[PDB]
């Protein structure tokens, strides 16, 4: 699975000293592009993208997102009028991109949200814009009569994919690397309860399975994951806890399944 993802937010309330429009690009979860309404320029966010592109590329990308900023500026006015609202805290969100699956087949998305709730989604197959809400019906007729569906189908199926294949090749050293996590497991006692905590520090790539074992057997009872959260250096962290009976510290182990490990790693307190 390979993914190219463009996500952008137009805000009424960023707020103080922060940009109202922020647009960012993602290749396989990795941030490579940034645009904001203050700077008014599209900038690289990784070393692998900056080394493989000239300023002729970035000026061209700047012209596109500057247009996208002004469209989403007016969208804030339009949808507040659509919902009969004045001022306040409001957001327009866009999610655009394409997938190259393990199958070798291509998925494509271009969908929006108003105030964190699904507004419209483009159907690549039928070449129509789906309206998730009754207030999104006037958007549907405006968008389809604009005739954007023709070009957007071609972009998501061809142009987006061509760029993504090129980006995967540009940043192969970073995207294909394997980083082994330093794993620790800690025990703490609250009120009449032992809570055990497992932490995987600094792993890449993102996919990871972290399970608890009691006497060898896998336990999901009173287990909780904090998901996969990022570090500042492009590596990942994950935090998994389990509630247990007091005294049972030596019974528990933390099973880590990751690409950097040829066999699963077990860790104890």
């Amino acid at each position: 699975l390979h993914t190219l993802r463009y996500i952008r937010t137009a805000m009424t309330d960023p707020g103080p000293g922060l940009p109202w429009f922020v647009d960012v690009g993602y290749v396989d979860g990795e941030l490579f592009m940034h645009y904001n309404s203050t700077a008014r320029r599209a900038v690289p966010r990784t070393e692998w993208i900056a080394a493989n592109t000239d300023q002729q590329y970035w000026d061209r990308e700047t012209q596109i997102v500057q247009g996208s900023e002004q469209i989403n500026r007016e969208n804030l006015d339009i949808l507040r009028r659509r919902y009969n609202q004045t001022g306040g805290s409001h957001t327009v969100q866009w999610m655009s991109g394409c997938d190259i699956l393990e199958d070798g087949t291509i998925r494509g998305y271009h969908q929006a949200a108003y105030d964190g709730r699904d507004f419209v989604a483009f159907d690549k197959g039928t070449m129509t814009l789906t309206a998730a809400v009754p207030e999104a019906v006037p958007t549907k007729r405006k968008w389809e009569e604009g005739g954007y569906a023709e070009g957007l189908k071609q972009y998501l199926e061809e142009t987006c994919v061509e760029w993504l294949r090129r980006y995967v090749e540009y940043g192969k050293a970073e995207l294909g690397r394997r980083e082994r996590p330093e794993v620790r497991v800690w025990g703490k006692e609250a009120d009449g309860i032992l809570t055990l905590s497992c932490r995987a520090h600094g792993f890449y790539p993102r996919p990871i399975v972290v399970s608890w074992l009691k006497d060898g057997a896998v336990r999901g009872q009173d287990a909780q994951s904090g998901g996969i959260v990022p570090n500042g250096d492009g590596t990942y962290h994950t935090w998994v806890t389990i509630d247990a009976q007091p005294g049972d510290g030596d019974k528990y182990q933390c099973r880590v399944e990751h690409a950097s490990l040829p066999q699963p790693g077990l860790y104890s307190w």
Partner: peptide
């Protein structure tokens, strides 16, 4: 690798 058509953002 953005699309030339930024009008596709119209709501």
């Amino acid at each position: 690798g953005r699309a030339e058509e930024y009008g596709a953002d119209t709501l």
